[PDB]
């Protein structure tokens, strides 16, 4: 019961077959998640390189709304999997607790949800054994998807099984006897997910299992009127018993219910002794252009940031500005140079107060007068 | 129940631009990424395209680079390989695939195609449809003692490509050989049938090959002559 | 409708096919001998899964953790077959009192030491390193022995007071372990200590160790009986003797008892038990495995009457004597790979003694 | 020039077991393929195996085909033949060929020389 | 007694304080907390005024001392990786850690006294001040104690030199005895980021089970892990983030308590270090003095 | 931007055969395994070299050492006799093996030559074309050469062998020579002389022109 | 400014013309300012915080650096009376 620094506390639960413990730093005082999964009930080969590969696949795959991996801890009997922990619990416990929730929050946690599965499917990988005690709350009552790649290994190993066990989460293709699942199994059950959150209850229930599997491949469902018919558009075309009408992410995301309040962050792209090391310094501001345009381009800067200027020569300016919560007034001159013909170098110097005692200070506005100057300018 | 039927092929002009479908019934197209491939008479197959739709990024082998465009229809689960400028080297079977780029495993990114299609036959030739020209081949009389006497009919410059043969012997057939067809350089087709029976049955069992092409309407009879 | 068996391949299979063959012959029932790598971790996951092998060959440590997952059958042995073995070997092999395995053999630790390169061995741990300092100017060296395995360092560890588990009334107390107190520390510094002052190599494991002393690149081995034929087969001028004193107290080493347990997934389970009490437990059986590799003490009374004349055997049944039993315990499975992860963090340089201990303490009975 | 050298063979007891060798040298031997041929007294030239390049078909004729075991080496560049179950009407003079088909498994045949395995 | 030090103190000016060429960083108060300690480690400075651009003023002061409330603060795990290091900002960083202590940048003018610069810093709990020239309202330079020890021993030569410095450093009773802060070898680096950040110490002698010195862990040595990129894993032991510097130490300045102070100070000036610790020949710790206790004692 | 290279055998049934890929460049393990009957949609066997498509059964077994992916069928099924495909796909694009066939053993059987003469038909027409017939051979390979006028005439010659029998497993191979009307004027003999696996000395027939 | 003696006394931002009849090319910086874009000397037998003597010409010029995360390294080595500072300041971007 320690790893790492990890000590083991109670035995959270043990859903399938991996037990489930609350970890514990003692140095630091945080919790994490520890996974074990018995070597006796679920794997064939013991051979370490499949250990390398999920060491190497599983780490990587960062997302903020999926329950990242930290290291997965090899062992004998077991192996351990140091998932991240959260005190919020099931969303399943969350709607029973609560019952029917409102549509501003489930579209919120909907959101959430769907961009955790289309993060694992941009990345190339399912989560077959989807359900609401799969997804956790965090503090913050954000979504958190449990797990991607234990599912896959026991939805191949006995996928008969997960069926007689819950038929309702299980996808009306592996009660027909379809091989693999594919993300078709992804979409469904993030409906189902969809209408917990939006009714409370669950649209497949029976007590007789193969009349809830002929219920399963039946495409229908109920429907109150506690929710308005935008949504069940999108049900209806989420919740096909046959894949090629079912919705995908793009069928989504062109949804019209989807797009009401839609955080910019879950889809990224939508068009698409000392030692100290040296560092080489510049003078100036080296452009290569006319410099008859460069005093022009000065110009076009310091107009923009309400400056008082004047000139001596056509290439000497001397600026001033009148700060705003600072009474004094701050002073310095711009000055032209040619390195060579083709490159023209832009020269900063400032000049002393010769008798005022201003407060603030000298040299750092004087440094806000040219940081300003730089990002206009951006040569 | 996942059944891939192609459609839009047939029979071609070079140079003409040819569009076939591939309706996707059973999933969704819109994950899986629809793959076709060539199946040259005699070679091996050869990968000719791709589309992917869920990141909207294709692909294309070295030998097809910029000229068949490939199209997916999300809508009508369909996949449209647009072929253009095509050469008379492609000439093949086109099967359509589905193809699985998902970590079936912890250990395993599974990169296989798991369901094909029957496939369609597209045939290029410059040649228009032509009938055949049966002609017998005749028996020898010198024979070694104790061998069989091979008989067999010439199907040569034809086209297109079924032509089933029969005899007048029997509905059932006996030391029969039918040999695959060669395309040869005039761009038709050619095609040998033999058929090996004991020599003492020259000067009295009798056989006449029946010619049977469906695409063009030619049933021609031959009389096979032991004729020095 | 077979009977498989699987052994550790330092051990005498060859006898074993012998008499499988012996029972082909006389029932026409073929055996099949295997040796697989790691099979105390192989066995069980294939054994949830109801299938592999009907009969195993290990010792009794892991018994316990095989019965608690139902993987192993209960045995009916007769009252004849009880007075026939020794009853510590029988309650070795006890598991919330009832009997899960048949005892095989006793196996102890000894040291053996080279004649020829040594022929007075030493009595006192401390003066191995003053033996060293001699012997690496001769182009030799005092000890090596198996440093990535646990079961041949713990001896070192316990002779200053170190323990796995404490046994007062028939029940190891899992919260009292005694492997993070003054004498487990005393004995892993030590054992670092050899490292870092050039005495021993880290990387040392079974078959360096083992190819060290069939060339007589070596002094003295810790190792079991089971690598006697290799070291006859060297013609090294070998000797036998009792492990040194540490601290004027003697080494603790684990007591193993080899035994003989059936899967209880296994159809062929009255097959086993005829095999075994007619062929295996007996003066005939044992000496066909005791030829190819020797087993050391066995459990029937009979055969070590005329084995008890070696007096390698007989040093080997002394510090089994002054050595400790292993407990036979679930936890110890939890017990064995976090001391070998100890002692390989221990000897490798990557923590300290204090660290590798806590680690080895926190972790002993549960994980 | 090419050579080419047989051993073994002679009066055997019919029904026993003969081994014949067949080698040659002066050229490479890993890509090209050995054969046996049979010509009895009164019939013409008969096959008996053939053995491919790297161990891809070992092929026999309708009556050896579950009495002769043939078989080559890379290293002492040899062949042999396991000749069992012999008969006594079997009796002919045996030669080897070399298949002078380079990087095709086709074969053109010619034989260097033959012993003569006679069967009591 | 201090007479003649005092009086040094207030005729000497911090103007003479000023080295000849001096490399000085300040930080905008809207930059994000990751870069700027990069940007120490680049330039090596251990002090940074920072400088609020909506305020127009020098508002505070971002140290190796805000690293170690940082990294005590917002560090999680060794597995997870700091996320709270990368987003937060000074502006955000200062608005949470001082919510019940507001301290205002404390400075002095060049043109002031030495004295009152002791005096600023002994009684502010404070290393290192600047000095901002209040005709113009620049900053010049960051002034240390070190500094003001190698200013002052310079200048002592004169005849009057042992007024005190004859005596011993335990009938004095300069340096902190009584509550000494220790760690062992093998003790984490958080544990002693805890320390740092329960006491206001600024060093820890490093100890073994007996109690010998064999290291010392201090304040800088926290931003090599820094710089090479361990900031993440702070679970490792002090052993091994001593490691760094294996290659160039000797070993540990220790005194003694029957030692004269003269001694003390020209070893210590010598060595370019801030405090020595106290053995005896068993070499336990008995204490730690330190420039801000021996400054005390000089300026009163 | 890659190539792969099978091999090609023939074996008994219940014959454990091996097929190496060697791939080109250096690629991960993503090559897949097809299994395609003639005339048929390619069956996939074994998706990532290792480890066994659902389906199937046990039979094919895939092992990995470096860039040379092997397939091994033990225990061959008398339904198991069909061409299969290498096929790397980790890279950009896909290439395919060249393809090996499996075909049933058998023994060798010497083949059966007989000409063809060209009929009269076929003389008015202008086209007549000469064939010469191998029946009941074995193995596939065999080297057909038309020395017609004591002249070894290459590049109107046209193999076409045929796949094997069901109940006989014999091969056919027919070789049309084709030529003109106006090309018998430089025409007195035609010879097909073909070299066999197990014909141990070559046989051509020919027949004079005019009788 | 009071302390400048301009020719046109204004200082006001709309007489700000490119539309001046000089074609003149600006004066050459003086070659100690070679060093300064290329070389920066910093003493590693000293203290770090100590620097090496600059020169009297380097004094109020910027020093930019490349851009490798969003910060701004801009500095400024300016004089006192007779003591030298050198001012880095990093501002986010
Ligand atoms: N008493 C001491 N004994 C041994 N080493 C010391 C001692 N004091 C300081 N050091 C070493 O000197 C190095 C830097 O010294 P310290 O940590 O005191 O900062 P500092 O040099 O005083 O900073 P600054 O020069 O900015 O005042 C550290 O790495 C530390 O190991
Ligand atoms: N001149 C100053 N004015 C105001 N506050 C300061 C000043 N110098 C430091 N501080 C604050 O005092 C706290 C403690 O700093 P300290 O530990 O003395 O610095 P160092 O780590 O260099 O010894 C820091 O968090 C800093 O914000
Ligand atoms: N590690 C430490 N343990 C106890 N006291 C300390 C430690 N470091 C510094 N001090 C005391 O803290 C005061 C200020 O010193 P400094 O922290 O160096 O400015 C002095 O009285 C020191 O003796
Ligand atoms: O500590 C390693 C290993 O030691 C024991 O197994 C030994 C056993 O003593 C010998 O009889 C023989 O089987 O070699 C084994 C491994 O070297 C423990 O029984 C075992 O649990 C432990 O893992």
Same mark, same amino acid.
């Given at each position: 019961?320690?790893? $790492?620094?990890?000590?083991?506390?109670?035995t959270?639960?043990?859903?399938?077959?991996?037990?489930?413990?609350? $970890?514990?730093?003692?140095?630091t005082?945080?919790?994490?998640?520890?996974?074990i999964?018995?070597?006796?009930?679920?794997?064939?080969?013991?051979?370490?390189?499949?250990?390398?590969?999920?060491?190497?696949?599983?780490?990587?795959?960062?997302?903020?709304?999926i329950?990242?991996?930290?290291?997965?801890?090899?062992?004998?009997?077991?192996?351990?999997?140091?998932?991240?922990?959260?005190?919020?619990?099931?969303?399943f416990?969350?709607?029973?607790?609560?019952?029917?929730?409102?549509?501003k929050?489930?579209?919120?946690?909907?959101q959430?949800?769907?961009?955790?599965?289309?993060?694992?499917h941009?990345?190339?990988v399912?989560?077959?054994?989807?359900?609401?005690?799969?997804?956790?709350?965090?503090?913050?009552?954000?979504?958190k998807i449990?797990?991607?790649?234990?599912?896959?290994?026991?939805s191949?190993?006995?996928?008969?099984?997960?069926?007689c066990?819950?038929?309702?989460?299980?996808?009306?293709?592996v009660?027909?006897?379809?091989?693999?699942?594919?993300?078709?199994?992804?979409?469904?059950?993030?409906?189902?997910?969809?209408?917990?959150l939006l009714?409370?209850?669950?649209?497949?229930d029976?007590?007789?299992?193969?009349?809830?599997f002929?219920?399963?491949?039946?495409?229908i469902?109920?429907?109150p009127?506690?929710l308005?018919?935008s949504?069940?558009?999108?049900?209806?075309?989420?919740?096909?018993?046959?894949?090629?009408?079912?919705?995908?992410?793009?069928?989504?995301?062109?949804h019209?219910?989807?797009?009401?309040?839609?955080?910019?962050?879950?889809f990224?792209?939508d068009?698409?002794?000392?030692?100290?090391?040296?560092?080489?310094?510049?003078?100036?501001?080296?452009?290569?252009?006319?410099?008859?345009?460069?005093?022009a381009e000065?110009?076009?800067?310091?107009?923009?940031?309400?400056?008082?200027?004047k000139?001596?020569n056509?290439?000497y300016?001397?600026?001033?500005?009148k700060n705003?919560?600072?009474?004094?007034?701050?002073k310095?001159?711009?000055?032209?140079?040619?390195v060579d013909?083709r490159?023209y170098?832009?020269?900063?110097?400032?000049?002393?107060?010769?008798?005022?005692?201003?407060?603030?200070?000298?040299?750092?506005?004087?440094?806000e007068?040219?940081?300003?100057?730089?990002?206009?300018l951006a040569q | 129940?996942?059944?891939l039927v192609?459609?839009?092929?047939?029979?071609?002009?070079?140079?003409?631009?040819?569009?076939?479908?591939?309706?996707?019934?059973?999933?969704?197209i819109?994950?899986?990424?629809?793959?076709?491939?060539?199946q040259?008479?005699?070679?091996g197959?050869?990968?000719?395209?791709?589309?992917?739709?869920?990141?909207?990024?294709?692909?294309?082998?070295?030998?097809?680079?910029?000229?068949?465009?490939?199209s997916?229809?999300?809508?009508k689960?369909?996949?449209?390989?647009?072929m253009?400028?095509?050469?008379?080297?492609?000439t093949?079977?086109?099967?359509?695939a589905?193809?699985?780029?998902?970590?079936?495993?912890?250990?395993?990114?599974?990169?296989?195609?798991?369901?094909?299609?029957?496939?369609?036959?597209?045939?290029?030739?410059?040649?228009?449809?032509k009938?055949?020209?049966?002609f017998?081949?005749?028996?020898?009389s010198?024979?070694?003692?104790?061998?069989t006497?091979?008989l067999?009919?010439?199907?040569?410059?034809?086209?297109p490509?079924?032509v089933?043969?029969?005899?007048?012997?029997?509905?059932?057939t006996?030391?029969?050989?039918?040999?695959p067809?060669?395309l040869?350089?005039s761009?038709?087709?050619?095609?040998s049938?033999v058929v090996?029976?004991?020599?003492?049955?020259?000067?009295?069992?009798?056989?006449?090959?029946?010619v049977?092409?469906?695409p063009?309407?030619?049933?021609?009879d031959?009389?096979?002559?032991?004729?020095? | 409708?077979?009977?498989?068996?699987w052994?550790?391949?330092?051990?005498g299979?060859?006898?074993?096919?012998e008499?499988?063959?012996?029972?082909?012959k006389?029932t026409?029932?073929?055996?099949?001998?295997?040796?697989?790598?790691?099979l105390?971790?192989?066995?069980?996951?294939?054994?949830?899964?109801?299938?592999?092998?009907?009969?195993i060959?290990?010792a009794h440590?892991?018994?316990?953790?095989?019965?608690?997952?139902?993987?192993?059958?209960?045995?009916?042995?007769?009252?004849?077959?009880?007075?026939?073995?020794?009853?510590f070997?029988?309650?070795?092999?006890?598991?919330?009192?009832?009997?899960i395995?048949?005892?095989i053999?006793v196996?102890?630790?000894?040291?053996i030491?080279?004649?020829?390169?040594?022929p007075?061995?030493?009595?006192?741990?401390?003066?191995?390193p003053?033996?060293?300092?001699?012997?690496?100017?001769?182009?030799?060296?005092?000890?090596?022995?198996?440093?990535?395995?646990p079961?041949?360092?713990?001896?070192?560890?316990?002779?200053?007071g170190?323990?796995?588990?404490?046994?007062?009334?028939?029940k190891?107390?899992?919260?009292?372990?005694?492997?993070?107190?003054?004498?487990?520390?005393?004995?892993?510094?030590?054992?670092?200590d050899?490292?870092?002052?050039?005495?021993?190599?880290?990387?040392?494991?079974?078959?360096?160790?083992?190819a060290?002393?069939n060339?007589?690149?070596?002094?003295?081995?810790?190792?079991?009986?089971?690598?006697?034929?290799?070291?006859?087969?060297?013609?090294v001028?070998?000797?036998?003797?009792?492990?040194?004193?540490?601290?004027?107290?003697?080494?603790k080493?684990?007591?193993?008892?080899?035994?003989?347990?059936?899967?209880?997934?296994?159809?062929?389970?009255?097959?086993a038990?005829?095999?075994?009490?007619?062929?295996?437990?007996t003066?005939?059986?044992l000496?066909?495995?005791?030829?190819?590799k020797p087993?050391?003490?066995?459990?029937?009374?009979?055969?070590?009457?005329?084995?008890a004349?070696?007096?390698?055997?007989?040093?080997?049944?002394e510090?089994?004597?002054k050595?400790?039993?292993?407990?036979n315990?679930?936890?110890?499975?939890?017990?064995?790979?976090?001391?070998?992860?100890?002692?390989?963090?221990a000897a490798?340089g990557?923590?300290?003694?204090?660290?590798?201990?806590?680690?080895?303490q926190?972790?002993?009975?549960?994980? | 020039?090419?050579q080419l050298?047989?051993?073994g063979?002679?009066?055997?007891?019919?029904?026993?077991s003969?081994?014949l060798?067949?080698?040659?040298?002066?050229?490479?031997?890993?890509?090209?393929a050995?054969?046996?041929?049979?010509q009895?007294?009164?019939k013409?030239?008969?096959?008996?195996?053939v053995?491919?390049?790297?161990?891809?078909?070992?092929?026999?004729?309708?009556?050896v085909?579950?009495?002769?075991?043939?078989?080559?080496?890379?290293?002492k560049?040899?062949?042999?033949?396991?000749?069992?179950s012999?008969?006594?009407?079997?009796?002919?003079?045996?030669?080897c060929?070399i298949?002078?088909?380079?990087?095709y498994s086709?074969?053109?045949?010619?034989?260097?020389?033959?012993?003569q395995?006679?069967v009591? | 007694?201090?007479?003649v *030090?005092?009086?040094?103190?207030?005729?000497?000016?911090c103007?003479?304080?000023?080295?000849?060429?001096?490399?000085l960083?300040?930080?905008?108060?809207?930059?994000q907390?990751?870069?700027?300690?990069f940007?120490?480690?680049?330039?090596?400075?251990?002090?940074?005024?920072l400088?609020?651009?909506?305020?127009q003023?020098?508002?505070?002061?971002?140290?190796?001392?805000?690293?170690?409330?940082?990294?005590?603060?917002?560090?999680?795990?060794?597995?997870?990786?700091?996320?709270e290091?990368?987003?937060?900002?000074?502006?955000?960083?200062?608005?949470?850690?001082?919510?019940?202590?507001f301290?205002?940048?404390?400075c002095?003018?060049?043109?002031?006294?030495?004295?009152?610069?002791?005096?600023?810093?002994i009684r502010?709990?404070?290393?290192?001040?600047?000095?901002?020239?209040?005709?113009?309202?620049?900053?010049? *330079?960051?002034?240390?104690?070190?500094?003001?020890?190698?200013f002052?021993?310079?200048?002592?030569?004169?005849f009057?030199?042992?007024?005190?410095?004859?005596?011993?450093?335990?009938?004095?009773?300069?340096?902190?005895?009584?509550?000494?802060?220790?760690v062992?070898?093998?003790?984490?680096?958080?544990v002693?980021?805890?320390?740092?950040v329960?006491?206001?110490?600024?060093?820890?002698?490093?100890?073994?089970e007996?109690?010998?010195?064999?290291?010392?862990?201090?304040?800088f040595?926290?931003?090599?892990?820094?710089?090479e990129?361990?900031?993440?894993?702070?679970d490792v032991?002090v052993?091994?983030a001593?490691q760094?510097?294996?290659?160039?130490?000797?070993?540990?300045?220790?005194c003694?308590?029957?030692?004269?102070?003269?001694?003390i100070?020209?070893?210590?000036?010598?060595?370019?270090?801030?405090?020595?610790?106290?053995?005896?020949?068993?070499?336990?710790?008995?204490?730690?003095?330190?420039?801000?206790?021996?400054?005390?004692?000089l300026?009163? | 931007?890659?190539?792969?290279?099978?091999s090609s055998?023939?074996?008994?049934?219940?014959?454990r055969?091996?097929?190496?890929?060697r791939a080109?460049?250096?690629?991960?393990?993503?090559?897949?395994?097809?299994?395609?009957?003639?005339?048929?949609?390619?069956?996939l066997?074994?998706?990532?070299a290792?480890?066994?498509?659902?389906?199937?059964?046990?039979?094919?077994?895939?092992?990995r050492?470096?860039?040379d992916?092997?397939l091994?069928?033990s225990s061959l099924?008398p339904?198991?006799f069909?061409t299969?495909?290498c096929?790397?796909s980790?890279?950009?694009?896909?290439?395919?093996?060249?393809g090996?066939?499996?075909?049933?053993?058998?023994?060798?059987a010497?083949?059966?030559?007989?000409?063809?003469?060209?009929?009269?038909?076929?003389?008015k027409?202008?086209?007549?074309?000469?064939?010469?017939?191998?029946?009941?051979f074995?193995?596939?390979?065999?080297?057909?050469?038309?020395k017609?006028?004591?002249?070894?005439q290459?590049?109107?010659?046209?193999?076409?062998?045929?796949?094997?029998?069901?109940?006989?497993?014999?091969?056919?191979?027919?070789?049309?020579?084709?030529?003109?009307?106006?090309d018998?004027?430089?025409?007195?003999?035609?010879a097909?002389?073909?070299?066999?696996?197990?014909?141990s000395?070559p046989?051509?027939?020919?027949?004079?022109?005019?009788? | 400014?009071?302390?400048?003696?301009?020719?046109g006394?204004?200082?006001?931002?709309?007489?700000?013309?490119?539309?001046?009849a000089?074609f003149?090319?600006?004066?050459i910086?003086?070659?100690?300012?070679?060093?300064?874009?290329?070389?920066?000397?910093?003493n590693?037998?000293?203290?770090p915080?100590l620097?090496?003597?600059?020169?009297?010409?380097?004094?109020?010029?910027?020093?930019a650096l490349?851009?490798?995360?969003?910060?701004?390294?801009?500095?400024a080595?300016?004089?006192?009376?007779?003591?030298?500072?050198?001012?880095?300041?990093?501002?986010?971007?």
């Open positions: 019961v320690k790893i $790492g620094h990890y000590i083991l506390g109670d959270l639960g043990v859903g399938t077959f991996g037990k489930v413990k609350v $970890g514990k730093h003692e140095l005082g945080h919790k994490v998640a520890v996974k999964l018995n070597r006796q009930k679920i794997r064939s080969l013991d051979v370490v390189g499949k250990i390398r590969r999920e060491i190497q696949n599983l780490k990587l795959f960062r997302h903020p709304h329950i990242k991996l930290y290291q997965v801890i090899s062992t004998p009997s077991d192996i351990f999997m140091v998932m991240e922990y959260v005190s919020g619990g099931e969303l416990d969350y709607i029973c607790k609560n019952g029917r929730l409102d549509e929050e489930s579209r919120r946690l909907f959430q949800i769907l961009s955790g599965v289309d993060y694992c941009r990345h190339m399912v989560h077959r054994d989807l359900k609401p005690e799969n997804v956790l709350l965090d503090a913050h009552m954000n979504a449990a797990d991607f790649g234990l599912s896959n290994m026991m191949d190993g006995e996928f008969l099984r997960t069926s066990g819950s038929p309702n989460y299980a996808a009306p293709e009660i027909s006897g379809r091989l693999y699942a594919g993300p078709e199994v992804d979409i469904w059950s993030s409906g189902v997910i969809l209408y917990a009714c409370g209850t669950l649209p497949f029976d007590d007789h299992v193969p009349t809830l002929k219920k399963i491949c039946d495409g469902f109920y429907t009127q506690y308005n018919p949504v069940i558009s999108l049900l209806k075309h989420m919740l096909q018993v046959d894949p090629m009408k079912r919705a995908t992410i793009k069928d989504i995301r062109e019209e219910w989807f797009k009401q309040d839609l955080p910019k962050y879950l990224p792209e068009p698409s002794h000392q030692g100290v090391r040296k560092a080489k310094w510049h003078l100036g501001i080296r452009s290569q252009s006319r410099p008859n345009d460069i005093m000065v110009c076009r800067a310091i107009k923009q940031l309400d400056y008082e200027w000139v001596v056509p290439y300016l001397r600026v001033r500005r705003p919560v600072t009474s004094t007034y701050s310095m001159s711009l000055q032209l140079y040619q013909s490159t170098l832009l020269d900063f110097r400032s000049i002393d107060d010769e008798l005022t005692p201003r407060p603030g200070s000298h040299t750092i506005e004087f440094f007068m040219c940081a300003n100057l730089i990002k206009i | 129940e996942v059944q192609e459609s839009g092929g047939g029979l071609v002009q070079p140079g003409g631009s040819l569009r076939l479908s591939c309706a996707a019934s059973g999933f969704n819109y994950y899986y990424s629809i793959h076709w491939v060539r040259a008479p005699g070679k197959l050869e990968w000719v395209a791709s589309i992917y739709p869920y990141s909207g990024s294709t692909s294309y082998a070295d030998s097809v680079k910029g000229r068949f465009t490939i997916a229809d999300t809508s689960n369909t996949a449209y390989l647009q253009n400028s095509l050469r008379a080297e492609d093949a079977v086109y099967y359509c589905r193809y699985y780029p998902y970590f079936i495993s912890y250990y395993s990114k599974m990169e296989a195609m798991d369901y094909w299609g029957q496939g369609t036959l597209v045939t290029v030739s410059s040649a228009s449809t009938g055949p020209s049966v017998p081949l005749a028996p020898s010198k024979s070694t003692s104790g061998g006497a091979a067999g009919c010439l199907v040569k410059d034809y086209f490509e079924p089933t043969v029969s005899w007048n012997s029997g509905a059932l006996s030391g029969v050989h039918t040999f067809a060669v040869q350089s761009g038709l087709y050619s095609l049938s090996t029976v004991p020599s003492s049955s020259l000067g009295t069992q009798t056989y006449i090959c029946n049977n092409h469906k063009s309407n030619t049933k021609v031959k009389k096979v002559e032991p004729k020095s | 409708g077979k009977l498989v068996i052994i550790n391949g330092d051990k299979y060859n006898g074993l096919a008499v499988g063959k012996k029972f082909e006389d026409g029932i073929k055996v099949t001998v295997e040796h697989p790598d790691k105390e971790e192989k066995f069980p996951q294939v054994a949830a899964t109801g299938d592999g092998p009907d009969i060959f290990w440590d892991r018994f316990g953790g095989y019965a608690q997952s139902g993987l192993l059958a209960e045995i009916t042995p007769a009252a004849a077959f009880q007075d026939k073995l020794y009853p070997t029988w309650d070795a092999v006890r598991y919330n009192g009832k009997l395995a048949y005892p053999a196996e102890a630790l000894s040291l030491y080279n004649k020829d390169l040594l007075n061995p030493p009595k006192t741990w401390e003066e191995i003053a033996l060293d300092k001699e012997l690496k100017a001769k182009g030799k060296s005092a000890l090596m022995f198996n440093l990535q395995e079961y041949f360092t713990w001896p070192l560890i316990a002779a200053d170190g323990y796995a588990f404490k046994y007062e009334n028939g190891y107390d899992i919260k009292d372990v005694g492997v993070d107190n003054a004498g487990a520390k005393a004995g892993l510094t030590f054992l670092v050899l490292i870092k002052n050039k005495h021993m190599n880290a990387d040392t494991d079974y078959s360096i160790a083992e060290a002393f060339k007589g690149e070596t002094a003295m081995t810790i190792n079991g009986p089971w690598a006697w034929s290799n070291i006859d087969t060297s013609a001028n070998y000797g036998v003797t009792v492990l040194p004193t540490f601290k004027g107290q003697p080494s080493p684990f007591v193993g008892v080899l035994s003989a347990g059936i899967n209880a997934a296994s159809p062929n389970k009255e097959l038990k005829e095999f075994l009490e007619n062929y295996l437990l003066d005939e059986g000496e066909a495995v005791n030829k190819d087993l050391g003490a066995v459990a029937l009374k009979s055969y070590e009457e005329e084995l004349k070696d007096p390698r055997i007989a040093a080997t049944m510090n089994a004597q050595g400790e039993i292993m407990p315990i679930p936890q110890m499975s939890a017990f064995w790979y976090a001391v070998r992860t100890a002692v390989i963090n490798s990557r923590q300290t003694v204090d660290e590798a201990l806590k680690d080895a926190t972790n002993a009975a549960e994980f | 020039q090419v050298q047989e051993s063979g002679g009066l055997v007891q019919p029904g026993g003969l081994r060798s067949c080698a040659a040298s002066g050229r490479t031997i890993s890509r090209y050995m054969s046996w041929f049979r009895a007294p009164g013409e030239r008969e096959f008996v195996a053995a491919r390049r790297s161990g891809d078909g070992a092929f026999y004729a309708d009556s085909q579950g009495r002769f075991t043939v078989s080559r080496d890379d290293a560049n040899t062949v042999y033949l396991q000749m069992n012999l008969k006594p009407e079997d009796t002919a003079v045996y030669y060929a298949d002078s088909d380079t990087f086709g074969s053109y045949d010619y034989w260097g020389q033959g012993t395995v006679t009591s | 007694n201090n007479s *030090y005092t009086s040094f103190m207030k005729s000497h000016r103007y003479d304080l000023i080295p000849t060429s001096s490399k960083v300040v930080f905008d108060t809207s930059l907390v990751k870069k700027a300690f940007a120490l480690v680049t330039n090596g400075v251990r002090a940074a005024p400088w609020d651009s909506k305020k003023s020098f508002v505070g002061m971002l140290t190796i001392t805000d690293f170690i409330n940082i990294l005590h603060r917002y560090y999680k795990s060794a597995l997870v990786q700091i996320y290091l990368e987003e937060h900002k000074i502006e955000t960083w200062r608005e949470v850690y001082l919510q019940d202590s301290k205002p940048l404390v002095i003018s060049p043109n002031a006294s030495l004295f009152d610069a002791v005096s600023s810093l502010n709990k404070i290393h290192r001040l600047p000095v901002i020239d209040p005709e113009s309202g620049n900053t010049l *330079y960051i002034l240390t104690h070190k500094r003001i020890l190698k002052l021993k310079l200048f002592i030569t004169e009057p030199k042992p007024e005190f410095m004859s005596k011993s450093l335990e009938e004095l009773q300069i340096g902190t005895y009584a509550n000494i802060a220790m062992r070898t093998t003790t984490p680096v958080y002693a980021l805890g320390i740092f329960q006491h206001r110490v600024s060093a820890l002698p490093v100890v073994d007996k109690g010998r010195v064999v290291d010392i862990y201090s304040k040595d926290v931003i090599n892990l820094a710089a990129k361990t900031y993440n894993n702070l032991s052993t091994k001593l760094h510097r294996s290659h160039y130490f000797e070993g540990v300045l220790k003694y308590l029957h030692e004269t102070l003269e001694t100070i020209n070893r210590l000036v010598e060595a370019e270090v801030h405090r020595l610790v106290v053995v005896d020949e068993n070499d336990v710790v008995k204490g730690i003095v330190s420039l801000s206790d021996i400054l005390q004692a300026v009163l | 931007q890659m190539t792969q290279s099978p055998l023939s074996a008994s049934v219940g014959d055969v091996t097929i190496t890929c080109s460049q250096s690629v991960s393990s993503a090559v897949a395994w097809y299994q395609q009957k003639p005339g048929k949609a390619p069956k066997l074994i998706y990532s290792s480890s066994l498509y659902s389906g199937v059964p046990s039979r094919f077994s895939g092992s050492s470096g860039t992916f092997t091994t069928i099924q339904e198991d069909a299969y495909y096929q790397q980790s890279s950009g694009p896909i290439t395919f093996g060249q090996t066939k499996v075909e049933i053993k058998r023994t060798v010497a083949p059966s030559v007989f000409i063809f003469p060209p009929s009269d038909s076929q003389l027409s202008g086209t007549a074309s000469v064939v010469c017939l191998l029946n009941n074995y193995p596939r390979e065999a080297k057909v050469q038309w017609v006028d004591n002249a070894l290459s590049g109107n010659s046209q193999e076409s062998v045929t796949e094997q029998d069901s109940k006989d497993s014999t091969y056919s191979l027919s070789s049309t020579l084709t030529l003109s009307k106006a018998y004027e430089k025409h007195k003999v035609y097909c002389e073909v070299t066999h696996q197990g014909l000395s046989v051509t027939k020919s027949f004079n022109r005019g009788e | 400014d009071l302390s400048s003696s301009p020719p006394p204004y200082g006001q931002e709309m007489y700000a013309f490119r539309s001046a000089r003149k090319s600006p004066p910086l003086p070659p100690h300012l070679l060093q300064v874009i290329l070389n920066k000397d910093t590693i037998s000293c203290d915080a620097l090496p003597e600059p020169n009297h010409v380097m004094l109020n010029h910027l020093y490349s851009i490798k995360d969003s910060v701004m390294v801009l500095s080595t300016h004089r006192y009376k007779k003591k030298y500072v050198t001012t880095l300041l990093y501002k986010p971007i």
